[PDB]
Amino acid sequence: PIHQLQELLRLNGVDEEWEPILLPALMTLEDSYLEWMAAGEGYIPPRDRLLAAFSTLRPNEVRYILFGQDPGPRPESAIGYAFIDGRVREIFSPRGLSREVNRATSLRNFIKMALVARGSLDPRDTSQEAIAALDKTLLVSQMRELRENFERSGVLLLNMALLFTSKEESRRHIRAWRAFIEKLLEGFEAYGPTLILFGAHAREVQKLKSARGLPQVALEHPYNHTFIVNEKAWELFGPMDLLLKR
């Protein structure tokens, strides 16, 4: 069971530094569950990416924990990060945002919000035309790069459940992973990262005894167009400059 867990961390490229925090948390899962997960069949993302959010950051670099619900329904979308859609490649296109970004509503509005936050777009014109006209030499061009700048800001992209099987079971999986999220937050108490809580998650995470210690920022949810012009979102994400290429 532990041997399997250290194989799992490996398989995902997660550094040994994570073991004091990650192994206890993963040890909160029931063991029928852990054997099944070790078989690595019947769920997304693939087992070698379950822990992808932990594969670059080290515990002492985490400054923000950004929550999502679960890896979602599309296999191509789920790559082990809470908020990033695996189907996106190019952020932009000659008419503005790419097709993949535009269908991913939350990400479309988050990117527009970032463009507004840095002052590239005026909050009253965030059309695809306004975006198409902007000079993008200094901005990232790939979803890969957006996620990497999430990690350069210390943002752990954490899903409440690290795997998905089918829509109907998502609730069950979330209940299976709660103790894990929770031991996990227990481990960060000393570090004190800020929990970034979209929509219902804010209220939900209050039920965790251990979320109580950590600082929190409750925002509404980027699927709403209102999120584009929400100045608390500008204040939180602006200093990260997530669209600036490095």
C-alpha positions as YAML, in Angstrom:
chain: A
units: angstrom
residues:
- id: 1
  name: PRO
  ca: [0.00, 0.00, 0.00]
- id: 2
  name: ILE
  ca: [2.78, 2.47, 0.85]
- id: 3
  name: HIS
  ca: [5.08, 0.81, -1.67]
- id: 4
  name: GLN
  ca: [2.34, 1.33, -4.26]
- id: 5
  name: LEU
  ca: [2.02, 4.98, -3.18]
- id: 6
  name: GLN
  ca: [5.71, 5.76, -3.63]
- id: 7
  name: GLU
  ca: [5.49, 4.07, -7.01]
- id: 8
  name: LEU
  ca: [2.53, 6.38, -7.80]
- id: 9
  name: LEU
  ca: [4.35, 9.56, -6.78]
- id: 10
  name: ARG
  ca: [7.20, 8.46, -9.00]
- id: 11
  name: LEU
  ca: [5.07, 7.62, -11.90]
- id: 12
  name: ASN
  ca: [3.81, 11.13, -11.77]
- id: 13
  name: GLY
  ca: [7.28, 12.59, -11.25]
- id: 14
  name: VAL
  ca: [6.46, 13.90, -7.76]
- id: 15
  name: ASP
  ca: [9.54, 14.67, -5.70]
- id: 16
  name: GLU
  ca: [10.24, 12.91, -2.41]
- id: 17
  name: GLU
  ca: [9.83, 16.26, -0.62]
- id: 18
  name: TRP
  ca: [6.06, 15.74, -0.99]
- id: 19
  name: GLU
  ca: [5.99, 12.44, 0.91]
- id: 20
  name: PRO
  ca: [5.39, 13.89, 4.43]
- id: 21
  name: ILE
  ca: [2.30, 15.74, 3.14]
- id: 22
  name: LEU
  ca: [1.11, 13.57, 0.27]
- id: 23
  name: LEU
  ca: [1.51, 10.03, 1.63]
- id: 24
  name: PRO
  ca: [-0.65, 10.62, 4.76]
- id: 25
  name: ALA
  ca: [-3.34, 12.31, 2.67]
- id: 26
  name: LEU
  ca: [-3.43, 9.53, 0.08]
- id: 27
  name: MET
  ca: [-3.47, 7.08, 2.98]
- id: 28
  name: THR
  ca: [-6.92, 8.40, 3.89]
- id: 29
  name: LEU
  ca: [-8.44, 6.55, 0.95]
- id: 30
  name: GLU
  ca: [-10.21, 3.25, 1.58]
- id: 31
  name: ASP
  ca: [-8.15, 0.31, 0.33]
- id: 32
  name: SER
  ca: [-10.52, -1.26, -2.19]
- id: 33
  name: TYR
  ca: [-10.24, 2.20, -3.73]
- id: 34
  name: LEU
  ca: [-6.43, 2.25, -3.56]
- id: 35
  name: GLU
  ca: [-6.04, -1.21, -5.10]
- id: 36
  name: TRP
  ca: [-8.43, -0.23, -7.90]
- id: 37
  name: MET
  ca: [-6.57, 3.04, -8.48]
- id: 38
  name: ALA
  ca: [-3.28, 1.13, -8.53]
- id: 39
  name: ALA
  ca: [-4.73, -1.04, -11.30]
- id: 40
  name: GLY
  ca: [-4.97, 2.27, -13.18]
- id: 41
  name: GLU
  ca: [-7.98, 1.23, -15.25]
- id: 42
  name: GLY
  ca: [-11.43, 2.72, -15.67]
- id: 43
  name: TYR
  ca: [-10.79, 6.37, -14.84]
- id: 44
  name: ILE
  ca: [-9.32, 9.65, -16.05]
- id: 45
  name: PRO
  ca: [-6.79, 11.20, -15.97]
- id: 46
  name: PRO
  ca: [-4.38, 8.31, -16.60]
- id: 47
  name: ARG
  ca: [-2.67, 7.09, -13.49]
- id: 48
  name: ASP
  ca: [0.69, 8.60, -14.50]
- id: 49
  name: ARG
  ca: [-0.97, 12.04, -14.28]
- id: 50
  name: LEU
  ca: [-3.18, 11.72, -11.18]
- id: 51
  name: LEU
  ca: [-0.64, 13.78, -9.18]
- id: 52
  name: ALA
  ca: [0.43, 16.14, -11.98]
- id: 53
  name: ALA
  ca: [-0.33, 19.22, -9.86]
- id: 54
  name: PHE
  ca: [2.45, 18.04, -7.51]
- id: 55
  name: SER
  ca: [5.02, 17.16, -10.20]
- id: 56
  name: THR
  ca: [6.71, 20.59, -10.45]
- id: 57
  name: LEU
  ca: [6.04, 22.59, -7.28]
- id: 58
  name: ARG
  ca: [7.55, 21.62, -3.96]
- id: 59
  name: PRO
  ca: [5.50, 22.01, -0.73]
- id: 60
  name: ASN
  ca: [7.39, 25.10, 0.47]
- id: 61
  name: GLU
  ca: [6.66, 26.89, -2.85]
- id: 62
  name: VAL
  ca: [2.86, 26.60, -2.60]
- id: 63
  name: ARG
  ca: [1.32, 30.04, -2.04]
- id: 64
  name: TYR
  ca: [-2.19, 29.47, -3.41]
- id: 65
  name: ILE
  ca: [-4.44, 26.43, -3.66]
- id: 66
  name: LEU
  ca: [-6.94, 26.85, -6.51]
- id: 67
  name: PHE
  ca: [-9.73, 24.31, -6.25]
- id: 68
  name: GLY
  ca: [-11.73, 22.51, -8.88]
- id: 69
  name: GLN
  ca: [-14.32, 19.79, -8.49]
- id: 70
  name: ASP
  ca: [-13.05, 16.79, -10.48]
- id: 71
  name: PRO
  ca: [-11.13, 16.01, -13.71]
- id: 72
  name: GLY
  ca: [-14.41, 16.32, -15.68]
- id: 73
  name: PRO
  ca: [-15.95, 14.15, -18.39]
- id: 74
  name: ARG
  ca: [-13.67, 14.42, -21.42]
- id: 75
  name: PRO
  ca: [-10.59, 12.15, -21.49]
- id: 76
  name: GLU
  ca: [-8.61, 14.63, -23.60]
- id: 77
  name: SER
  ca: [-9.41, 17.41, -21.11]
- id: 78
  name: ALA
  ca: [-8.21, 15.67, -17.92]
- id: 79
  name: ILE
  ca: [-4.43, 15.95, -17.48]
- id: 80
  name: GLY
  ca: [-4.22, 16.14, -13.68]
- id: 81
  name: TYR
  ca: [-4.62, 19.89, -13.10]
- id: 82
  name: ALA
  ca: [-7.75, 21.37, -11.56]
- id: 83
  name: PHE
  ca: [-8.55, 24.26, -13.91]
- id: 84
  name: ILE
  ca: [-6.53, 23.72, -17.11]
- id: 85
  name: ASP
  ca: [-8.28, 22.03, -20.03]
- id: 86
  name: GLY
  ca: [-6.03, 19.51, -21.77]
- id: 87
  name: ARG
  ca: [-7.74, 20.07, -25.12]
- id: 88
  name: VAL
  ca: [-6.44, 23.65, -25.42]
- id: 89
  name: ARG
  ca: [-3.12, 24.24, -27.21]
- id: 90
  name: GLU
  ca: [-2.95, 27.71, -28.78]
- id: 91
  name: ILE
  ca: [-4.60, 30.39, -26.69]
- id: 92
  name: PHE
  ca: [-5.07, 32.78, -29.58]
- id: 93
  name: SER
  ca: [-6.01, 32.67, -33.24]
- id: 94
  name: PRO
  ca: [-6.04, 35.36, -35.93]
- id: 95
  name: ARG
  ca: [-9.60, 36.33, -34.96]
- id: 96
  name: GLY
  ca: [-8.88, 36.47, -31.22]
- id: 97
  name: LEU
  ca: [-9.11, 33.52, -28.84]
- id: 98
  name: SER
  ca: [-8.76, 30.05, -30.32]
- id: 99
  name: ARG
  ca: [-11.73, 27.74, -30.85]
- id: 100
  name: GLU
  ca: [-10.65, 25.47, -27.99]
- id: 101
  name: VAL
  ca: [-10.41, 28.41, -25.58]
- id: 102
  name: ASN
  ca: [-13.76, 29.80, -26.73]
- id: 103
  name: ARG
  ca: [-15.63, 26.54, -26.12]
- id: 104
  name: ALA
  ca: [-14.07, 26.22, -22.64]
- id: 105
  name: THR
  ca: [-16.25, 28.93, -21.14]
- id: 106
  name: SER
  ca: [-14.51, 29.25, -17.77]
- id: 107
  name: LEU
  ca: [-11.07, 29.47, -19.37]
- id: 108
  name: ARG
  ca: [-12.23, 31.93, -22.03]
- id: 109
  name: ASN
  ca: [-13.51, 34.27, -19.33]
- id: 110
  name: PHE
  ca: [-10.46, 33.76, -17.11]
- id: 111
  name: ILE
  ca: [-8.13, 34.68, -19.98]
- id: 112
  name: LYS
  ca: [-10.25, 37.73, -20.78]
- id: 113
  name: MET
  ca: [-10.11, 38.65, -17.10]
- id: 114
  name: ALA
  ca: [-6.32, 38.40, -17.16]
- id: 115
  name: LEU
  ca: [-6.18, 40.58, -20.28]
- id: 116
  name: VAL
  ca: [-8.33, 43.16, -18.49]
- id: 117
  name: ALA
  ca: [-6.34, 42.86, -15.25]
- id: 118
  name: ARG
  ca: [-3.06, 43.77, -16.96]
- id: 119
  name: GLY
  ca: [-4.72, 46.62, -18.88]
- id: 120
  name: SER
  ca: [-4.43, 45.10, -22.36]
- id: 121
  name: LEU
  ca: [-8.23, 45.13, -22.80]
- id: 122
  name: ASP
  ca: [-10.62, 47.77, -21.63]
- id: 123
  name: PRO
  ca: [-13.28, 46.27, -19.31]
- id: 124
  name: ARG
  ca: [-16.01, 47.46, -21.73]
- id: 125
  name: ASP
  ca: [-14.60, 45.73, -24.85]
- id: 126
  name: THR
  ca: [-13.44, 42.13, -24.43]
- id: 127
  name: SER
  ca: [-14.80, 40.89, -27.74]
- id: 128
  name: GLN
  ca: [-12.81, 38.60, -30.01]
- id: 129
  name: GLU
  ca: [-12.15, 41.68, -32.16]
- id: 130
  name: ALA
  ca: [-10.52, 43.59, -29.33]
- id: 131
  name: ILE
  ca: [-8.39, 40.53, -28.59]
- id: 132
  name: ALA
  ca: [-7.45, 39.99, -32.23]
- id: 133
  name: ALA
  ca: [-6.10, 43.55, -32.45]
- id: 134
  name: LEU
  ca: [-3.78, 43.24, -29.44]
- id: 135
  name: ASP
  ca: [-0.02, 42.87, -29.85]
- id: 136
  name: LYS
  ca: [0.78, 39.40, -28.51]
- id: 137
  name: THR
  ca: [4.58, 39.30, -28.88]
- id: 138
  name: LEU
  ca: [5.03, 39.46, -25.09]
- id: 139
  name: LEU
  ca: [2.19, 37.07, -24.16]
- id: 140
  name: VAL
  ca: [2.10, 33.30, -23.82]
- id: 141
  name: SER
  ca: [0.81, 31.37, -26.82]
- id: 142
  name: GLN
  ca: [0.10, 27.95, -25.27]
- id: 143
  name: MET
  ca: [-2.04, 26.52, -22.49]
- id: 144
  name: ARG
  ca: [1.16, 24.76, -21.35]
- id: 145
  name: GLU
  ca: [2.65, 28.18, -20.65]
- id: 146
  name: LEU
  ca: [-0.41, 29.46, -18.79]
- id: 147
  name: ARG
  ca: [-0.28, 26.44, -16.48]
- id: 148
  name: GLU
  ca: [3.47, 26.88, -16.01]
- id: 149
  name: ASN
  ca: [2.88, 30.49, -14.95]
- id: 150
  name: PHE
  ca: [0.26, 29.24, -12.51]
- id: 151
  name: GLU
  ca: [3.06, 27.19, -10.99]
- id: 152
  name: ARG
  ca: [5.56, 30.08, -11.04]
- id: 153
  name: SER
  ca: [3.07, 31.93, -8.83]
- id: 154
  name: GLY
  ca: [2.93, 28.99, -6.42]
- id: 155
  name: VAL
  ca: [-0.61, 27.97, -7.36]
- id: 156
  name: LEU
  ca: [-1.46, 24.34, -6.60]
- id: 157
  name: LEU
  ca: [-4.20, 23.35, -9.07]
- id: 158
  name: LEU
  ca: [-6.13, 21.02, -6.79]
- id: 159
  name: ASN
  ca: [-9.26, 19.03, -7.63]
- id: 160
  name: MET
  ca: [-11.45, 17.80, -4.77]
- id: 161
  name: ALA
  ca: [-11.40, 14.38, -6.45]
- id: 162
  name: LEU
  ca: [-8.26, 13.46, -8.38]
- id: 163
  name: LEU
  ca: [-10.03, 11.05, -10.75]
- id: 164
  name: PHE
  ca: [-13.23, 10.72, -12.77]
- id: 165
  name: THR
  ca: [-15.09, 7.62, -13.98]
- id: 166
  name: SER
  ca: [-18.57, 8.77, -15.08]
- id: 167
  name: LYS
  ca: [-20.88, 11.65, -14.28]
- id: 168
  name: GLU
  ca: [-23.13, 9.69, -11.92]
- id: 169
  name: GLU
  ca: [-20.25, 8.61, -9.67]
- id: 170
  name: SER
  ca: [-18.62, 12.04, -9.27]
- id: 171
  name: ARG
  ca: [-20.33, 12.69, -5.92]
- id: 172
  name: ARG
  ca: [-19.16, 9.30, -4.62]
- id: 173
  name: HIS
  ca: [-15.58, 10.01, -5.69]
- id: 174
  name: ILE
  ca: [-15.67, 13.40, -4.00]
- id: 175
  name: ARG
  ca: [-16.76, 11.76, -0.75]
- id: 176
  name: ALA
  ca: [-13.94, 9.25, -1.21]
- id: 177
  name: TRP
  ca: [-11.36, 12.02, -1.64]
- id: 178
  name: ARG
  ca: [-12.50, 14.46, 1.04]
- id: 179
  name: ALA
  ca: [-10.33, 13.02, 3.79]
- id: 180
  name: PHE
  ca: [-7.41, 13.24, 1.35]
- id: 181
  name: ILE
  ca: [-7.98, 16.91, 0.52]
- id: 182
  name: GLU
  ca: [-8.27, 17.47, 4.17]
- id: 183
  name: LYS
  ca: [-5.24, 15.71, 5.56]
- id: 184
  name: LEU
  ca: [-3.58, 17.55, 2.67]
- id: 185
  name: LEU
  ca: [-4.65, 20.94, 3.97]
- id: 186
  name: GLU
  ca: [-3.62, 19.80, 7.44]
- id: 187
  name: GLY
  ca: [-0.09, 19.43, 6.08]
- id: 188
  name: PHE
  ca: [-0.01, 23.01, 4.76]
- id: 189
  name: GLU
  ca: [-0.94, 24.66, 8.09]
- id: 190
  name: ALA
  ca: [2.65, 25.76, 8.72]
- id: 191
  name: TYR
  ca: [2.99, 27.14, 5.19]
- id: 192
  name: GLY
  ca: [-0.39, 28.89, 5.27]
- id: 193
  name: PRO
  ca: [-1.25, 29.11, 1.56]
- id: 194
  name: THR
  ca: [-4.30, 31.05, 0.45]
- id: 195
  name: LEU
  ca: [-7.27, 28.99, -0.75]
- id: 196
  name: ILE
  ca: [-8.76, 30.36, -3.99]
- id: 197
  name: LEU
  ca: [-12.42, 29.32, -3.82]
- id: 198
  name: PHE
  ca: [-14.62, 29.58, -6.92]
- id: 199
  name: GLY
  ca: [-18.37, 29.53, -6.29]
- id: 200
  name: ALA
  ca: [-19.81, 26.85, -4.04]
- id: 201
  name: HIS
  ca: [-16.39, 25.55, -3.02]
- id: 202
  name: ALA
  ca: [-16.03, 28.45, -0.61]
- id: 203
  name: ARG
  ca: [-19.00, 27.39, 1.46]
- id: 204
  name: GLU
  ca: [-18.18, 23.70, 1.05]
- id: 205
  name: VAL
  ca: [-14.61, 23.95, 2.25]
- id: 206
  name: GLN
  ca: [-15.78, 25.59, 5.49]
- id: 207
  name: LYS
  ca: [-16.89, 22.08, 6.51]
- id: 208
  name: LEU
  ca: [-13.24, 21.07, 6.55]
- id: 209
  name: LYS
  ca: [-11.79, 21.67, 10.04]
- id: 210
  name: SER
  ca: [-8.43, 22.40, 8.46]
- id: 211
  name: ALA
  ca: [-9.50, 24.94, 5.79]
- id: 212
  name: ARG
  ca: [-10.41, 27.11, 8.75]
- id: 213
  name: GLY
  ca: [-6.78, 27.89, 9.55]
- id: 214
  name: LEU
  ca: [-5.77, 28.86, 6.02]
- id: 215
  name: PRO
  ca: [-6.44, 32.28, 4.46]
- id: 216
  name: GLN
  ca: [-9.20, 32.23, 1.87]
- id: 217
  name: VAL
  ca: [-10.36, 34.30, -1.08]
- id: 218
  name: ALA
  ca: [-13.89, 33.60, -2.26]
- id: 219
  name: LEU
  ca: [-14.60, 34.50, -5.85]
- id: 220
  name: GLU
  ca: [-17.43, 33.79, -8.12]
- id: 221
  name: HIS
  ca: [-16.88, 31.35, -10.88]
- id: 222
  name: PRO
  ca: [-15.19, 32.15, -14.18]
- id: 223
  name: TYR
  ca: [-18.05, 30.65, -16.19]
- id: 224
  name: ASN
  ca: [-19.93, 33.87, -15.41]
- id: 225
  name: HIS
  ca: [-19.13, 36.77, -17.71]
- id: 226
  name: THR
  ca: [-19.20, 38.97, -14.60]
- id: 227
  name: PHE
  ca: [-15.88, 37.33, -13.65]
- id: 228
  name: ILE
  ca: [-14.15, 39.20, -16.50]
- id: 229
  name: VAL
  ca: [-14.69, 42.57, -14.82]
- id: 230
  name: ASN
  ca: [-14.53, 41.50, -11.15]
- id: 231
  name: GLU
  ca: [-11.90, 43.71, -9.54]
- id: 232
  name: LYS
  ca: [-11.28, 41.25, -6.75]
- id: 233
  name: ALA
  ca: [-10.25, 38.79, -9.46]
- id: 234
  name: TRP
  ca: [-8.04, 41.54, -10.93]
- id: 235
  name: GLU
  ca: [-6.50, 42.08, -7.49]
- id: 236
  name: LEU
  ca: [-5.83, 38.39, -6.92]
- id: 237
  name: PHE
  ca: [-4.63, 37.25, -10.34]
- id: 238
  name: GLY
  ca: [-3.21, 40.48, -11.78]
- id: 239
  name: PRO
  ca: [0.06, 40.37, -9.81]
- id: 240
  name: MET
  ca: [0.59, 36.83, -11.14]
- id: 241
  name: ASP
  ca: [0.67, 38.19, -14.73]
- id: 242
  name: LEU
  ca: [-0.39, 34.77, -15.96]
- id: 243
  name: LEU
  ca: [-0.37, 35.67, -19.67]
- id: 244
  name: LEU
  ca: [3.17, 37.14, -19.73]
- id: 245
  name: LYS
  ca: [5.65, 34.90, -21.56]
- id: 246
  name: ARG
  ca: [8.90, 34.01, -19.81]
...
